Amino acid sequence: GNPGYWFAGDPVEHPDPAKPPIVFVHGLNGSSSAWFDENDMAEQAWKNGYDAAFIDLHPDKDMQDNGAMLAAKLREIYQYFGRKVILVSYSKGGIDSQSALIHHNAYHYVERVITLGTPHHGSQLADLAYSNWAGWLADILGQKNDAVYSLQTGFMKSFRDQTDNHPNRLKTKYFTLAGNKIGGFGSALFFGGVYLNMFGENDGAVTEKNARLPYATNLDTGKWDHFSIIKGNLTFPVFMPLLTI
8 A cells, every 4th residue: 555645434424423433454564455355344334324544554564663653644533533533453453553552642542442363462473484484474474574573473572561561551442353263275374274273273364362462352252264354244243332432
């Protein structure tokens, strides 16, 4: 995509003050198109009466650069909607989200954060990419860069240390969703799944245990793989009750 660029979705037919706008945050090596290409998430939000905005952050930069950018654009989005937004963030987007709120003081603009298959404790596949490059691994992760590097478990352990004890952490409600379904036969997540099976239950890219935050409302592991977890028809109804206050 185009980093820094954000746009609002179609205006809701029947607006509701009880329904905060949702800012959708993509993952690693992605863009706002993740919510639209072969995905009905944008439609799920709009048809259920939710206003929304979609942002392109860096597909190739770490949570610090993405956190700073996201925090900057959240100020503009807050001004656009005239109220606090909910973040629905996928994969690395969940980490960029926390960085924005905690380390870049974006908490002022956000009601709550819902993370979908975010490797909050790092990716063993990212560890593998920086030890053994696999052809199939490029399909799950994208090509090696600062963003993939920032997903290593060692790097994430350090991020966790500096974030989980920060005073700003307590100012926002966190919710996590995680999958236990490995990629279907013929998908790159089949390989990632059987590899991650050495570590535990996983969605083909992130282990269920690494997709959680100690202080978050950790929603019961669903039968989703890393790609199916962002499919609107599958997970929007699941986190829809959380889209309140």
